[PDB]
Design a protein around this nucleic acid. Structure first.
Lengths: 122, 65, 218, 325, 216, 82
RNA sequence: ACGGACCAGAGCGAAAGCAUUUGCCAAGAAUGUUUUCAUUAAUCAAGAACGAAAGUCGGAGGUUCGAAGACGAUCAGAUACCGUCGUAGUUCCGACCAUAAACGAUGCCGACCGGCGAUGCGGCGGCGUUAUUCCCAUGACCCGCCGGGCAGCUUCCGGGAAAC
RNA sequence: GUUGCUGCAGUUAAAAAGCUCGUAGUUGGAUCU
C-alpha cells in the first residue's frame, strides 16, 4: 500500500531529534525547512520525509514517543514537570502508625514526637 | 546509480587451455569533482547538517548598530 | 589513523598513561586494539597455532569458513590468545590477532633456586582447568627449557617463560581447550598469592580519578 | 439529573424521568462500547453538555481528599461531581450541603471478608434468582436534581455532601453497601476494588473491608476481627534472580514494573458464544484451540487463568510431577 | 555518619520518612537485607530500622561527593516511580541521568550511540534495574542502590535500606540523597532548611496531572 | 618478586581486596576501587580527603560486598557504632 | 475375593514391603533426661538371617482373573492384534527356590561449606480463640524456637562431557 | 594418571553387591611438664 521506508523514517526521526524548534503542525512549513538544513536529493524523497514529520508531532500532542529523546518537551511538559503544590504532602497533621513502629521510634530517642497517632490493629 | 557509479570492464586474457573473462566493477565515491567522483550523491543517502547553535536569550537587549 | 572512543583510549592517545601496567593494576578492560599496539608496539609477534576449516550449517546448504587460533606474545611479559571464524583465511587471522590483543595478560615470572639474575620460570606450580583439559605448569631450574607439548610450548615461549615443566591431563587433542587451558594457567600466575605480596596495598588514584580534569575537555 | 458514564453503560433509559439531563462532553466520548455509542447515535436528544466553574471543582476536591476518595476518583469523575454541585447550587439552596464530613465509626465483627453476603443467588438456612427478580437486582433501594452514578467512590463523596442521588432505578438511593480496600501498613483506604497494591506505600497489602453510607451522611466500616486475614503465612519465600529478556516472566512485585509483552494469539483468546445467530452452521460446537503459534509453545497464559494457583503459599508441596508454569 | 552531631538524623527528617512510608518495607525478605531490619510484625510487614537507613544514605552521599566530575555519576531509574525524581536529582547534583529504557550495552559496547563511562552507578531498584547492575559488573562501577526488604544484593556496593515500592518513598529518598550530597559539598548550609520541596521529586502520574490541572 | 641483589623484578604489585585479602586479578572486571569521602567534624563538609576500599569480584558476586563495605566503614569511624 | 473412596511427595519398616474394627503378644525410631556404663566403636573376606513377582514340591481351597489350550472372526501370503470359553496358576497352610530397571540407574560411617519456609514426629516458650461464654487443668486451632525425619523452592559456593 | 602407593574411576559413558548382621583385616575421641 503506502508504508514508509527505512531511510525516510530514519531521516524524519533525525530531523525531529535536531530541529523541533523549527517544525510545526502545518505540512508545507515542514518542507521548505528540509531543503535548507539537510543535503537531501530531490522531491519524492524530499516530500516523503517532510510528510512523516507532520505525522510525528501530532503524536507528540498525544504525549510521548518511543523513538526520540531530546531534553525539551516544548514549553508545556516542562511546566507540568517542575510543578510543586502549595504545602508538601509529607507535612501532615496526624500520621497513623503501628505499635511496632512506635516501639522502634522509642528505641531511637524519638519518644517525644508529637504528630503520631498509634492506631491499634483491631 | 548503476550508470554513474559502477564502471564495468570486460576483457579476454588468453591462457593456454581456454579463456578467462574478468569483470571489475568499481563503485566510485562522492566528494564532487576535484577530479574525483560524481558530483551528485546517491539519491538514497541523506545527510543532516549540524545546527549552528543560536543564543538562548537572557534579556530583551537593544544594541543600536 | 586512530581516533579513540573510550576514556582509557583518550588517555592512552596522549601521554597520560605511561605503561600497560597502570591498566592492569586497576583491572580496567582494554576495549580497543590500538592501546596494546601502542604500548608494546613492534615487540608483539604472533604465531598462528591452527587454521581448522569448518562447514557452517546454513539454509543455503554448506559453505566453508575458517577458525583461527592465534597466540600473540611480547616476549618477557605479555601473552594473549584469540579465536576467530571467517569467510576468508586472512580475515580470520587478522580478526583473531585483534581479538588476541584485547586479551593480553601479564605473567608473573619467578625463580627456581636462589633468585639470581632475571626471572625465568613460573613462580609456583599453577594450573589451568578448561573443559576436561587440565594443564599444570611447574617451576623448572634455569636452562631446562619448556618441556611441553608443542602448543603450550609456543604459548609459554611467547609469554617469556624460559623453562617450565608442563603436564597435561584429559583430551589434550582438542586444540582450543588446550591452548585456552594453558592461557588460563598463565593468567593465574598473578592471581596466586605468595608471601611476596603480604604488604597492605596502598591505593593510588585510578587513571580516571587522577586525570578527571583532562577528561572534561573531551 | 446528572448522568455518569455508567448510566449509558447499563442503558438506563431515564430520559423520561428527569428534565435536568446534563452531562460532561468528555464522559460520553470515553465510552468504547459500540452498542452504547449506537444508543447515543439515536436517542431522544434532550441531553445537554455543560462544564462547570473552577470555583466548584476546587470545592469538591477540597474535601474529596478529606473523605479519602480523591485518589480513587478520576479527573472526569470530579467533573461530574462538580457539575452536580453547581447545578444544585443554581436552582436549589446551597445551604443544605455540608463541608468537611463526619468522623467514621469503626464497628468490627468476627466474619471473614470473603463471606458471600449481598450476593443475590447465595443463601444460608428463600433467596432465589427468578424471572421476576432479575430486573430488581440493583442494590439497597429506598425531587428535581440527582445523579446516575454506578461508581461507589462517586456515590461516597456525593452522599457525604448530602447531594440526593440515585441509580438505574427510579427512586432515590439511601444506603450504599460496598467493599473498600485498606492497606494494613499505612492505613490509607482506596475505593478502587481492582488494584492490588496501595497508592501510598506500594506494597501488596490491601485487604477487603465492607462500608455503608447513609443518605444522612454517616460512614461506617466493618473490620474483620478474624485471625485468618492478618496471617504471615506464604509471605517470606525465596525469589529467583532477576531475569531480563523477551520471555522472562518476573514474579510481579510493584504496580509499575515493566513486563515483556507476551500476548495471546487471536486464535487462542477467542471464546465460543453459543447465542450468536449464525453459531449453528459452524461445523463444531466449540471454537478450536491454538497449538500452532509461538504463544502456545511458550505457554503464554491469560491473567485470569491460573488464579487460585497464586493464592497457595509457595512453601508447600505441589504434586510430585507438576511444575506451576 | 561518623558519630557527628552535624550529620545526625533530626526530628523533621524522621517525620518526613514516616509520612513517606520508608520504614514500611516489603512482606518478603532476602536474608542479606536482614541486617538492616528492625522486626517483622504479626501482620507480615518487615519494618526497616530508620537509623540504619540514615547511615547508609550518608555513606552513599559520601561516595557521590568523592567524585570530582559530578557528571561521572550515572543515575538510573527504569521504572516510572523514580523518573521525575532521578531527573530532579541530576539537575541538582550535576549527575548524568538514564531515564526509562536502559539499552543493553550502554556500558560495554563502545560502538554504540549512547556509550558512556561512569565512575559510579546509582540505581533506584536492584530488582527492576538489574541490567545496568550487570553492565556495571562488567566495567568496574561501584553501585549505590535503594534496596527494599526484598531485593537481591548482587553487585550492589553501598545499599540503602528503604521502601522503594511506594511512590512517595522513592522520591523522598532521592530528595534526601540530593540534599546530603549538596550539604556535604558546602553548596547548601546545614542549619537552614533546604529551599527545594521534597514533593517536587514525587511521581506525577498522567491522570493525577488532570486532577491538578482542574483545581488551579 | 625481589631478587637476591635487591631489585624489584616484577611488572606490577597487584592490589589486594580489603575485604578478603585475595589478590584482585589483571582481568578481574567485577573489581571495585571505591573512594568514600571524609568530613569536617564541626562543619559536616567534604574535606578533600577520602578513605579507599578495594573489593574483588568474587566477593561482589556473592552480595557480601555491601556488608564488607559497611564493616570497613565501621572500622574507620565513617559509620558510627550502632 | 478383596479391603476402595479418606490415601498426601503423609507415615513406618534393614530391604522386600506395609491400610476394615477390636483384643492380645513382643519389638522399634525420634524426642526429654544435671541417669548409668566409660571406648564398649566405623567398615567389614569366611560365614549367617530376611529377600516382590514368577516357578517347584507336599496338603487344603477354588470368587474373579488367567499363561497354556480350544473354538469364533480376519486375508495376494497370516499362524500376532480382537471376541467367547477356559487348564496350571492367582487363595491359605508347611517346605523349597534367591532372582527384578530389588532405582536415587547414585557404598557405608564421619567432618566442613549459602539461604528460605511448609510438612511429620517429640520437646520448649508464648497473647488469644474454641469444648453451647466451659468452674480449674486438659484436648482443637494460632505465633514462634529446638532435634531427628520424608520432601521442596531458590542461589555465578564450588563442581562437572554435560544434562545437572 | 589406559592398573593409579605417589595418581584413575563407578548419575547418564564399562562399573555400587537386594538388604541387614557378622568372624578375621584395616581403622579408631580427648586427656598425663
Amino acid at each position: 500500500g503506502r508504508v514508509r521506508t527505512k531511510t525516510v523514517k530514519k531521516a524524519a526521526r533525525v530531523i525531529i531529534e535536531k530541529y523541533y524548534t523549527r517544525l510545526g503542525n502545518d505540512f508545507h512549513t515542514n518542507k521548505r525547512v528540509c531543503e535548507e538544513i539537510a543535503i537531501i536529493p530531490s522531491k519524492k524523497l524530499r516530500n516523503k520525509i517532510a510528510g512523516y514529520v507532520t505525522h510525528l508531532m501530532k503524536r507528540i500532542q498525544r504525549g510521548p514517543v518511543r523513538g526520540i529523546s531530546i531534553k525539551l518537551q516544548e514549553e508545556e511538559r516542562e511546566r507540568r514537570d517542575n510543578y510543586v503544590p502549595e504545602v508538601s504532602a509529607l507535612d501532615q497533621e496526624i500520621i497513623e502508625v503501628d505499635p511496632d513502629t512506635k516501639e522502634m521510634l522509642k528505641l531511637l530517642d524519638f519518644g517525644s514526637l508529637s504528630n503520631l497517632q498509634v492506631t491499634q490493629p483491631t | 546509480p548503476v550508470n554513474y557509479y559502477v564502471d564495468t570492464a570486460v576483457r579476454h586474457v588468453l591462457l593456454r587451455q581456454g579463456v578467462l573473462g574478468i569483470k571489475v566493477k568499481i563503485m566510485l565515491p562522492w566528494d564532487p569533482t576535484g577530479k574525483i567522483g560524481p558530483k551528485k550523491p546517491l539519491p538514497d543517502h541523506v545527510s543532516i547538517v549540524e545546527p549552528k547553535d543560536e543564543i538562548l536569550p537572557t534579556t530583551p537587549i537593544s544594541e543600536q548598530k | 589513523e586512530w581516533m579513540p572512543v573510550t576514556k582509557l583510549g583518550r588517555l592512552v592517545k596522549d601521554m597520560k598513561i605511561k605503561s600497560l601496567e597502570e591498566i592492569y593494576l586497576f583491572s580496567l578492560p582494554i576495549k580497543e586494539s590500538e592501546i596494546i599496539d601502542f604500548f608494546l608496539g613492534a615487540s608483539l609477534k604472533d604465531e598462528v597455532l591452527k587454521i581448522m576449516p569448518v562447514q557452517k550449517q546454513t539454509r543455503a546448504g554448506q559453505r566453508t569458513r575458517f577458525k583461527a587460533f592465534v597466540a600473540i606474545g611480547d616476549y618477557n611479559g605479555h601473552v594473549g590468545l584469540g579465536v576467530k571464524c571467517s569467510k576468508e583465511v586472512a580475515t580470520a587471522i587478522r580478526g583473531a590477532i585483534i581479538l588476541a590483543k584485547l586479551s593480553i595478560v601479564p605473567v608473573r615470572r619467578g625463580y627456581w633456586g636462589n633468585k639470581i639474575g632475571k626471572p625465568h620460570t613460573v613462580p609456583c606450580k599453577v594450573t589451568g582447568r578448561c573443559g576436561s583439559v587440565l594443564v599444570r605448569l611447574i617451576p623448572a631450574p634455569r636452562g631446562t627449557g619448556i618441556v611441553s607439548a608443542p602448543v603450550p610450548k609456543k604459548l609459554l615461549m611467547m609469554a617469556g617463560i624460559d623453562d617450565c615443566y608442563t603436564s597435561a591431563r584429559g583430551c589434550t587433542a582438542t586444540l582450543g581447550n588446550f591452548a585456552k587451558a594453558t592461557f588460563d594457567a598463565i593468567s593465574k600466575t598473578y592471581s596466586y598469592l605468595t608471601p611476596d605480596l603480604w604488604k597492605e596495598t596502598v591505593f593510588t588514584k585510578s587513571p580516571y580519578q587522577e586525570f578527571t580534569d583532562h577528561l572534561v575537555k573531551t | 439529573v446528572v448522568a455518569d458514564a455508567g448510566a449509558f453503560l447499563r442503558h438506563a433509559a431515564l430520559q423520561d424521568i428527569g428534565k435536568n439531563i446534563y452531562t460532561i462532553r468528555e464522559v460520553v466520548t470515553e465510552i468504547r462500547d459500540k452498542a452504547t455509542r449506537r444508543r447515543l447515535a439515536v436517542l431522544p436528544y434532550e441531553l445537554r453538555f455543560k462544564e462547570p466553574l473552577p470555583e466548584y471543582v476546587r470545592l469538591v476536591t477540597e474535601f474529596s481528599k478529606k473523605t479519602g476518595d480523591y485518589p480513587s476518583l478520576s479527573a472526569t469523575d470530579i467533573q461530574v461531581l462538580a457539575l452536580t454541585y453547581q447545578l444544585e447550587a443554581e436552582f436549589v439552596g446551597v445551604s443544605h450541603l455540608k463541608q468537611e464530613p463526619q468522623k467514621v465509626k469503626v464497628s468490627s465483627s468476627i466474619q471473614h471478608p470473603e463471606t458471600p453476603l449481598h450476593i443475590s443467588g447465595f443463601h444460608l438456612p428463600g433467596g432465589w434468582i427468578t424471572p421476576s427478580n432479575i430486573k430488581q437486582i440493583q442494590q439497597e433501594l429506598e425531587v428535581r436534581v440527582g445523579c446516575l452514578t454506578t461508581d461507589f467512590a462517586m456515590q461516597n463523596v456525593l452522599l457525604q455532601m448530602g447531594l440526593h442521588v440515585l441509580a438505574v432505578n427510579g427512586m432515590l438511593i439511601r444506603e450504599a453497601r460496598s467493599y473498600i480496600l485498606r492497606c494494613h501498613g499505612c492505613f490509607k483506604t482506596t475505593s478502587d476494588m481492582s488494584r492490588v497494591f496501595c497508592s501510598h506505600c506500594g506494597n501488596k497489602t490491601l485487604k477487603k473491608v465492607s462500608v455503608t453510607v447513609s443518605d444522612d451522611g454517616t460512614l461506617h466500616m466493618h473490620f474483620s476481627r478474624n485471625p485468618k486475614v492478618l496471617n504471615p503465612r506464604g509471605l517470606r519465600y525465596s525469589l529467583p534472580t532477576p531475569k531480563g529478556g523477551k520471555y522472562a516472566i518476573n514474579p510481579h512485585l510493584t504496580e509499575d514494573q515493566r513486563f515483556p509483552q507476551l500476548r495471546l494469539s487471536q486464535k487462542a483468546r477467542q471464546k465460543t458464544n453459543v447465542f450468536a445467530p449464525d453459531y449453528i452452521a459452524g461445523v463444531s460446537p466449540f471454537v478450536e484451540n491454538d497449538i500452532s503459534s509461538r504463544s502456545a509453545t511458550l505457554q503464554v497464559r491469560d491473567s485470569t487463568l491460573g488464579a487460585g494457583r497464586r493464592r497457595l503459599n509457595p512453601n508447600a508441596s505441589r504434586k510430585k510431577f507438576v511444575k506451576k508454569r | 555518619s561518623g558519630a557527628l552531631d552535624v550529620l545526625q538524623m533530626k526530628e523533621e527528617d524522621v517525620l518526613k520518612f514516616l509520612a513517606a512510608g520508608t520504614h514500611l518495607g516489603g512482606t518478603n525478605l532476602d536474608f542479606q537485607m536482614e541486617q538492616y531490619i528492625y522486626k517483622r510484625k504479626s501482620d507480615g510487614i518487615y519494618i526497616i530500622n530508620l537509623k540504619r537507613t540514615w547511615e547508609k544514605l550518608l555513606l552513599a552521599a559520601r561516595a557521590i561527593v568523592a567524585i570530582e566530575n559530578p557528571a561521572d555519576v550515572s543515575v538510573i531509574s527504569s521504572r516510572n516511580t523514580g523518573q521525575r525524581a532521578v531527573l530532579k536529582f541530576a539537575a541538582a547534583t550535576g549527575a548524568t541521568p538514564i531515564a526509562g529504557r536502559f539499552t543493553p550495552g550502554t556500558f560495554t559496547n563502545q560502538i554504540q550511540a549512547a556509550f558512556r563511562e561512569p565512575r559510579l552507578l546509582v540505581v533506584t531498584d536492584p530488582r527492576a534495574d538489574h541490567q545496568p547492575l550487570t553492565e556495571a559488573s562488567y566495567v568496574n562501577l561501584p553501585t549505590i542502590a535503594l534496596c527494599n526488604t526484598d531485593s537481591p544484593l548482587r553487585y550492589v556496593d553501598i545499599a540503602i535500606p528503604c521502601n522503594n515500592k511506594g511512590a512517595h518513598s522513592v522520591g523522598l529518598m532521592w530528595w534526601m540523597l540530593a540534599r546530603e550530597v549538596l550539604r556535604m559539598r558546602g553548596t547548601i548550609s546545614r542549619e537552614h532548611p533546604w529551599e527545594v520541596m521534597p514533593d517536587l521529586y514525587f511521581y506525577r502520574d498522567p491522570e493525577e496531572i488532570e486532577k491538578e490541572e482542574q483545581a488551579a | 618478586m625481589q631478587n637476591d641483589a635487591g631489585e624489584f623484578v616484577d611488572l606490577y604489585v597487584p592490589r589486594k581486596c580489603s575485604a578478603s585479602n585475595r589478590i584482585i586479578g589483571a582481568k578481574d572486571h567485577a573489581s571495585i576501587q571505591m573512594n568514600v569521602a571524609e568530613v569536617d567534624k564541626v562543619t559536616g563538609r567534604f574535606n578533600g580527603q577520602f578513605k579507599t576500599y578495594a573489593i574483588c569480584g568474587a566477593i561482589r558476586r556473592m552480595g557480601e560486598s555491601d556488608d564488607s563495605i559497611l564493616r570497613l566503614a565501621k572500622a574507620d569511624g565513617i559509620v558510627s557504632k550502632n
